[PDB]
Amino acid sequence: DGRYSLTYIYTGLSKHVEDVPAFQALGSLNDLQFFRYNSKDRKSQPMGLWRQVEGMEDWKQDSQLQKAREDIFMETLKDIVEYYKDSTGSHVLQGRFGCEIENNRSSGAFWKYYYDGKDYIEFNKEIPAWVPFDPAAQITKQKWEAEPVYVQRAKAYLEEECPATLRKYLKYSKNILDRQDPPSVVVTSHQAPGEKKKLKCLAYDFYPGKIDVHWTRAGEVQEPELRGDVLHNGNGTYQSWVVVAVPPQDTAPYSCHVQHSSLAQPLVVPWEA
Ligand SMILES: *[C@@H]1O[C@H](CO)[C@@H](O[C@@H]2O[C@H](CO)[C@@H](O)[C@H](O)[C@H]2NC(C)=O)[C@H](O)[C@H]1NC(C)=O
Q: Which CATH number characterizes residue 194's domain?
A: 2.60.40.10
Decide whether any atom of ligand 1 lies within 6 Å of the 205 Cβ: yes
Phi-psi sector, 194: left (phi>0), alpha (psi -120 to 50), beta: left
Same domain as 53, residue 40: yes
Which method was it determined by? X-ray
Same domain as 184, residue 169: no
CB 140 within 8 A of CB 76: yes
> At which of 136, 153, 179 does a domain end?
179
Decide whether any atom of ligand 1 lies within 6 Å of the 239 Cβ: yes
Same domain as 170, residue 43: yes
Q: Which residues pair with 268 in a beta bridge?
A: 257
Distance from Cα 75 to the centre of ligand 1, integer Å: 42
Between strands 211-217 and 254-260, the pairing is antiparallel
> At which of 179, 195, 218 does a domain end?
179
Give 61's contacts (C-beta < 8 A, 6+ positions apart): none
Q: Where is 150: in which H helix or E strand?
A: helix 149-156
Q: Which of 199, 201, 197, 200 is nearest to 268 (CA)?
A: 201
Q: Is 159 helix (H, G, I), strand (E, B) or coil?
A: helix
Please give the tally of structural domains in the chain.
Answer: 2
- Describe the crossing of helices 59-83 and 137-144 by its angle, rounded to 10 degrees: 130
Distance from Cα 40 to the centre of ligand 1, integer Å: 29
Which residue has the CA at smallest separation from atom 5 of ligand 1? 232
The domain in which residue 260 lies consists of: 180-269
Same domain as 43, residue 158: yes
Q: Is the peptide bond before 248 cis (omega within 30 degrees of 0)?
A: no
Distance from Cα 269 to the centre of ligand 1, integer Å: 21
Resolution of the experimental model, in Å, one decimal? 2.0
250 CB-contact burial (10 Å; exposed 0-12 / middle 13-18 / buried 19+): middle
Calpha distance 227→242 (Å, rounded): 4
Single-letter residue type at 22: A
Helical spans, DSSP H, in 13-130: 59-83
Same domain as 190, residue 126: no
Distance from Cα 235 to the centre of ligand 1, integer Å: 9
Same domain as 171, residue 67: yes
Distance from Cα 205 to the centre of ligand 1, integer Å: 8
Phi-psi sector, 16: left (phi>0), alpha (psi -120 to 50), beta: beta
Decide whether any atom of ligand 1 lies within 6 Å of the 237 Cβ: yes
